[PDB]
């Protein structure tokens, strides 16, 4: 509310693991996603709340990525699907859901 009422505070810095995305009004007109979130429930709630802000008025959303790092690979929905696959009965298995090809080819540098 302080950030909404006062037009001088340039940016509100916000954590994806916060809970009160139930607040419908945020006055600022851009969002920067500094990082990806490995946990997909937090990621989904963060995106959904940012799209709610975008519905309230036009915004620019910004996604930063390191060019050569693994973060480009986490951008793909398949990595989230990997975590989703491991989420089912991830206690009694051998923790070998990540196949060797998937691990190596997800990170390996190619021309």
């Amino acid at each position: 509310r302080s950030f909404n009422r006062d037009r001088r505070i340039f940016c509100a810095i916000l954590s994806t693991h916060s809970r009160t995305t139930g607040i419908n009004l945020v006055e600022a007109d851009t969002v920067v996603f500094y990082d990806n979130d490995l946990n997909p429930v937090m990621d989904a709630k963060a995106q959904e709340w940012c799209d709610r802000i975008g519905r309230c008025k036009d915004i620019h959303i910004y996604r930063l990525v390191s060019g050569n790092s693994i973060e480009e690979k986490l951008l793909k929905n398949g990595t989230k699907d990997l975590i989703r696959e491991v989420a089912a009965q991830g206690n009694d298995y051998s923790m070998a859901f990540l196949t060797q090809r998937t691990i190596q080819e997800l990170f390996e540098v190619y021309s």
Binding site: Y34, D35, N36, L38, D51, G54, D58, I59, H60, I61, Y62, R63, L64, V65, S66, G67, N68, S69, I70, E71, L74, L75, V86, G90, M95, A96, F97, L98, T99, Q100, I103, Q104, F107
Partner: protein, 62 residues
Amino acid sequence: KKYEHVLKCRLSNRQKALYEDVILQPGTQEALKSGHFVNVLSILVRLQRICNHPGLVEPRHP
């Protein structure tokens, strides 16, 4: 209205050094060759935390 932007940022030399150190450690290479979900997850919770800012993995002490 919604406009999507993805911006590529070049990692610094200190970030490159810590990144190559974590990758080339044998404890990472063995996990890559053999495979284990918790080990790869820990490798990423290291490497991406480096990738955000190397001060979270080794802060500059006074």
